[PDB]
Design a protein around this ligand. Structure first.
Ligand SMILES: [K+]
Ligand SMILES: [K+]
Ligand SMILES: [K+]
Ligand SMILES: [K+]
Ligand SMILES: [K+]
Ligand SMILES: [K+]
Ligand SMILES: [K+]
Ligand SMILES: [K+]
Ligand SMILES: [K+]
Ligand SMILES: [K+]
Ligand SMILES: [Mg+2]
Ligand SMILES: [Mg+2]
Ligand SMILES: [Mg+2]
Ligand SMILES: [Mg+2]
Ligand SMILES: [Mg+2]
Ligand SMILES: [Mg+2]
Ligand SMILES: [Mg+2]
Ligand SMILES: [Mg+2]
Ligand SMILES: [Mg+2]
Ligand SMILES: [Mg+2]
Ligand SMILES: [Mg+2]
Ligand SMILES: [Mg+2]
Ligand SMILES: [Mg+2]
Ligand SMILES: [Mg+2]
Ligand SMILES: [Mg+2]
Ligand SMILES: [Mg+2]
Ligand SMILES: [Zn+2]
Lengths: 98, 132, 61, 84, 216
RNA sequence: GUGAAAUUCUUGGAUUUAUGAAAGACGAACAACUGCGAAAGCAUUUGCCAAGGAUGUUUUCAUUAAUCAAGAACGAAAGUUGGGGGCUCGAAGACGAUCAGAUACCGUCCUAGUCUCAACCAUAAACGAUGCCGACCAGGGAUCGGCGGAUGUUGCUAGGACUCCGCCGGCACCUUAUGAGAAAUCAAAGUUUUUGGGUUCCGGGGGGAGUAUGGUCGCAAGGCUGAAACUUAAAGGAAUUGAC
RNA sequence: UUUUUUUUUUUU
C-alpha cells in the first residue's frame, strides 16, 4: 500500500536529485527527502551571557550568533525526535509547528 | 605593560570536539604559543576528556598561567571538528568560555572559526552511515 | 562555599525523580542566579550551602 | 460564468475579447495595421503591429519600429494611428 | 627552563590609512647565535578587526590582515595584506527565498599590487512586493556580475593600495555597484566580501615609511 | 576513537597554533512540493560551438499525420581491457573490540575501485511500480516561461524591479463526487454490462524458473530469446478488530 | 543508541 502521495520526498518534474550526508550518522539521503533544520542560536548560552558581558573588554559589543544547517536522514530524525510519527490525517499537515 | 589598566590581548583558540577540548592561547599573529591546556590533561578516564568540568578546569589553569605572562584579555576562536565532520561545538566550549570569563580575564571578540568546506571530500562511514 | 536561597522550584528531575531542580539566588550577590540540582525535600525560601558555585545544573534524565 | 447563464451563440463582447484568439466562436487575430509617421517627415508608412523586421522610412532612413517578443516597439519620436 | 624569560615584547603599528596605530603586542625569542629576533617577526600576519582599527563598532564585521614588513626598535611596522568578512556576518547575510550573486576579478594597482577582489550581493524586495520571493533570472544575474566585475576592475586599476583601502573602509565601491546595478534588479548588502594579495612589489623602505609616522 | 576500550600516533615532538606550497577530488550556504532534458541525467565563472521548448505571428507548405514488428541512437551505479591520475572514502584483506561464537554490526590500516581518456558492458524499486496521440469533463489559490492591458512608486538607467487584471504553455498542490474503484485511493486510475476514438506492448492460480536446452551478443561478468517433467490448495491484494 | 539466542506434532 502507498502511504504518502509524494512518496516521502519532494521530487516533481525531475529525474535525479543528488544526496546529502546525514549530519548525525553520515548516511546518504536525497536532499529533497532529508529533514532539514536551520539552527540560529547565540554562541554564549543564556546562562553564561551575564558573565561574558561583565568580562567584556570593550565599552560595547554584540555577541555573535551560531548558524548551523542540520540535514537528517529519516532514521536519525525520528530517533532524535526531530520529527515524530503522526496519525494518518495529521501527517498531511505541512505547516511548521507554531 | 605601561599602565595597570592597559589590556594586553591574546587569542584563545578553543577546539571543542566531542572527544576532547583544547584551550590554546597564542599572540595576535598566532605564531607564538602562551599556554595549551586540554581536557584530557585534567581527567583520568578517556570518556571525560570532553566533559564540561574538564573544560572548566583547563580554562582555570589557562587563565592562571596567562595572568603570569602579562595577558589581560583574550580573543575567542571557537571551532568544531569541521571538514566533512560535525560542525557542532562539543559540550566543553560553553564551559571553557564561562570559566575564562569568570577567572578575571576580559573577553574580546568572539568568532566561530570552524573549517567549512565550500565542498568537501567524501565523509567516512559508507553510504549507509553509522549503523547502531 | 557560598549561600544561596531558593526562589522557585522548577520540578522533579532524573530517571526516578530523585533530585529536584531549583533556581537559587546568592545571598552575597543578589543579582546572580544559578541552576542547581537538590537531593531531598526542598521548598521555596530554603537556603543551601554551595560548596562550589561555578557549575550549572542540567536535567539528569 | 455558469454554463446555463450564458448563450454559446451570443457571448458578451468582453468575454470574446478576453478569450484566446483561436478559442473564440470565430477565430480572429489581435494584430492590426497602423499608420506611423516620423517626427519631422510628412511621409506616412504602414506598419504591422507585430512586425518582425526593422521598418525604415525611405526618405530620412530612420527606424520606425523594433521587433520584440510580441508587438513591435516604435521609436520615441514616431507616432501611430490604428489603420483599419 | 622557562622559554618565556628569553622572549621580548614588540608593538604592532598599523598603516596611516587606519585611525588607530597601536594594534597590539607580540613577542619573539631574543637573538641567540644565528637566530635573529628580527627575522622571527618578519612577514608575520596579524588579523585585526576593523572596529579596533577605526574604533567604530559598526565595522566589527570586517577583518583586516596586516603583514609585518619591517622591524625598527621595539615597533613592528605593518601594511595592508588583505581583508575578509567574519563568519557570523556572512552567515547572517545569506538567507532563503532570495538570490545570491557573487563575482571576482584579478586587478593590479599603480603600485604593482596584484590582488583578487570578491564581491557579494543579494536581491532586495520592494516595499509593496507581495510575492514571497525575490529571484533574479539567470540573464539578469549575469548582467549584474558583468557590472560588478567592470566596476571593481575600474576602481582598483585607477588607484594604488593606499587609496584602494581608503575606498574599502567606507564601502564606496559597494555603494557604486548598488547604484549601477539597480537598473537591472534591486540589490541589498552589496559588499567587497574578500580581498587577497596575489603578488606584491619588491620591498622598498621608502614606500613603507610613507605610511608610518616617526616613532621616537 | 568508543556505550567503555584497544589496535594506532606520540620528547627523533604527536595532537594543537600561524604562514606558505603541491596534488586530486568535491562544487556547501543560496537550493524551493522551483528549472532544463527522450530517459539516464544536469548546480563555480567567462568564451566558443551547434541544438531546443513555450510564447508572438493577418509569414510559408498543404495532409506531409498517429502508433509502431524488424532494425537502430542513448542508457545511473557496479563491472571489464589499457593508459593517465590516484586527495578522500573504501569492496577484498589484515588487526582491535563486542559476543557463547561474531567470518558482522562499532573502531583502526588498507588493495581493487572511487576521477579522466579510448574501447566494452546494456542492466536498476532504470518508479508515477500508472504506453503514446486525440476529444469532453468541477471549483480554487499558488508558482515557472512567454505575451496583452492598466496603474503607482523606484538613492536606478523608454526600459528594468514591484502592484493589479487577463491569454497560452509547464512542474505541482488544495477542496469536492454528480464519477470510478475490492478498497487504499484517483480530477484522471472519470466519461464502461447504457460495454466500440486510433494505435504498440503485455498477464492468465502458486512453484519448478527466468531454471534446462538451442540460438544470438559480449574479452569476461553476463545480456536477449526461453521450455518441460514434476509438485501443490492455496499463494496473493485492500481494509477491520484484537494481540504484540 | 553497550548487551537481549531459542520455544516438537494435531486440536481446542
Ligand atoms: K510508490
Ligand atoms: K522528508
Ligand atoms: K575522549
Ligand atoms: K587511491
Ligand atoms: K577494505
Ligand atoms: K550473544
Ligand atoms: K553491465
Ligand atoms: K518511486
Ligand atoms: K498557470
Ligand atoms: K494429527
Ligand atoms: Mg507498510
Ligand atoms: Mg532515477
Ligand atoms: Mg582520549
Ligand atoms: Mg537504529
Ligand atoms: Mg546491538
Ligand atoms: Mg523579469
Ligand atoms: Mg594551514
Ligand atoms: Mg534555477
Ligand atoms: Mg556554490
Ligand atoms: Mg587504469
Ligand atoms: Mg582512510
Ligand atoms: Mg568506473
Ligand atoms: Mg528490466
Ligand atoms: Mg509570468
Ligand atoms: Mg501461472
Ligand atoms: Mg537456536
Ligand atoms: Zn542519520
Amino acid at each position: 500500500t502507498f502511504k504518502r502521495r509524494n512518496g516521502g520526498r519532494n521530487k516533481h518534474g525531475r529525474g535525479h536529485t543528488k544526496f546529502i550526508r546525514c549530519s548525525n550518522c553520515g548516511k546518504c539521503c536525497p536532499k529533497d527527502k532529508a529533514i532539514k533544520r536551520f539552527l540560529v542560536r547565540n554562541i554564549v548560552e543564556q546562562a553564561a551571557v551575564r558573565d561574558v558581558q561583565e568580562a567584556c573588554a570593550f565599552e560595547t559589543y554584540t555577541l555573535p550568533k551560531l548558524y548551523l544547517k542540520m540535514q537528517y536522514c529519516v532514521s536519525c530524525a525520528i530517533h532524535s525526535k526531530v520529527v515524530r510519527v503522526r496519525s494518518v490525517t495529521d501527517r498531511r499537515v505541512r505547516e511548521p509547528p507554531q | 605593560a605601561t599602565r595597570e589598566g592597559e589590556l594586553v590581548f591574546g587569542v584563545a583558540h578553543i577546539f571543542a570536539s566531542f572527544n576532547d577540548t583544547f584551550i590554546h592561547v597564542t599572540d595576535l599573529s598566532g605564531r607564538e604559543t602562551m599556554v595549551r591546556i586540554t581536557g584530557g590533561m585534567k581527567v583520568k578516564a578517556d570518556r571525560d576528556e570532553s566533559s564540561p568540568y574538564a573544560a572548566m578546569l583547563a580554562a582555570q589553569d589557562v587563565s592562571q598561567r596567562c595572568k603570569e605572562l602579562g595577558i589581560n584579555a583574550l580573543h575567542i576562536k571557537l571551532r568544531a571538528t569541521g571538514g566533512n565532520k560535525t560542525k557542532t561545538p562539543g559540550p566543553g566550549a560553553q564551559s571553557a568560555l564561562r570559566a575564562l570569563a569568570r577567572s578575571g580575564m576580559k573577553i574580546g571578540r568572539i568568532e566561530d572559526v570552524t573549517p567549512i568546506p565550500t565542498d568537501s571530500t567524501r565523509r567516512k562511514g559508507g553510504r549507509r552511515g553509522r549503523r547502531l | 562555599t557560598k549561600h544561596a536561597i531558593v526562589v522557585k522550584v522548577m520540578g522533579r528531575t532524573g530517571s526516578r525523580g530523585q533530585v529536584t531542580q531549583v533556581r537559587v539566588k546568592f545571598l552575597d550577590d543578589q543579582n546572580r542566579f544559578i541552576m542547581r540540582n537538590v537531593k531531598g525535600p526542598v521548598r521555596e525560601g530554603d537556603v543551601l550551602t554551595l560548596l562550589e558555585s561555578e557549575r550549572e545544573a542540567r536535567r539528569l534524565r | 460564468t455558469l454554463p446555463n447563464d450564458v448563450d454559446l451563440l451570443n457571448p458578451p463582447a468582453e468575454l470574446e475579447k478576453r478569450k484566446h484568439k483561436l478559442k473564440r466562436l470565430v477565430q480572429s487575430p489581435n494584430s492590426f495595421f497602423m499608420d506611423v509617421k516620423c517626427q519631422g517627415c510628412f511621409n506616412i508608412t504602414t506598419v504591422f503591429s507585430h512586425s518582425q523586421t526593422v521598418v525604415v522610412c525611405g526618405n530620412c532612413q530612420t527606424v520606425l519600429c523594433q521587433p520584440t517578443g510580441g508587438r513591435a516597439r516604435l521609436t520615441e519620436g514616431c507616432s501611430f494611428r490604428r489603420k483599419g | 627552563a622557562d622559554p618565556y624569560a628569553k622572549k621580548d615584547w614588540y608593538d604592532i603599528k598599523a598603516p596611516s590609512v587606519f585611525d588607530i596605530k597601536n594594534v597590539g603586542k607580540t613577542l619573539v625569542t631574543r637573538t641567540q647565535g644565528t637566530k635573529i629576533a628580527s627575522e622571527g617577526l618578519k612577514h608575520r600576519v596579524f588579523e585585526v578587526s576593523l572596529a579596533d582599527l577605526q574604533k567604530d563598532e559598526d565595522q566589527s564585521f570586517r577583518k583586516i590582515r596586516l603583514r609585518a614588513e619591517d622591524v625598527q626598535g621595539k615597533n613592528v611596522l605593518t601594511n595592508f595584506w588583505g581583508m575578509d568578512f567574519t563568519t557570523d556576518k556572512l552567515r547572517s547575510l545569506v538567507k532563503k527565498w532570495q538570490t545570491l550573486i557573487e563575482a571576482h576579478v584579478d586587478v593590479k594597482t599603480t603600485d604593482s599590487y596584484t590582488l583578487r577582489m570578491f564581491c557579494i550581493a543579494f536581491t532586495k524586495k520592494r516595499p509593496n512586493q507581495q510575492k514571497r520571493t525575490c529571484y533574479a533570472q539567470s540573464s539578469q544575474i549575469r548582467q549584474i556580475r558583468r557590472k560588478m566585475v567592470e566596476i571593481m576592475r575600474n576602481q582598483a586599476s585607477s588607484c594604488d593600495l593606499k587609496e584602494l583601502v581608503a575606498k574599502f573602509i567606507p564601502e564606496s565601491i559597494g555603494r557604486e555597484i548598488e547604484k549601477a546595478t539597480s537598473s537591472i534588479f534591486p540589490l541589498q548588502n552589496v559588499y567587497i566580501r574578500k580581498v587577497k594579495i596575489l603578488k606584491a612589489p619588491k620591498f622598498d623602505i621608502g614606500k613603507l615609511m610613507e605610511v608610518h609616522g616617526d616613532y621616537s
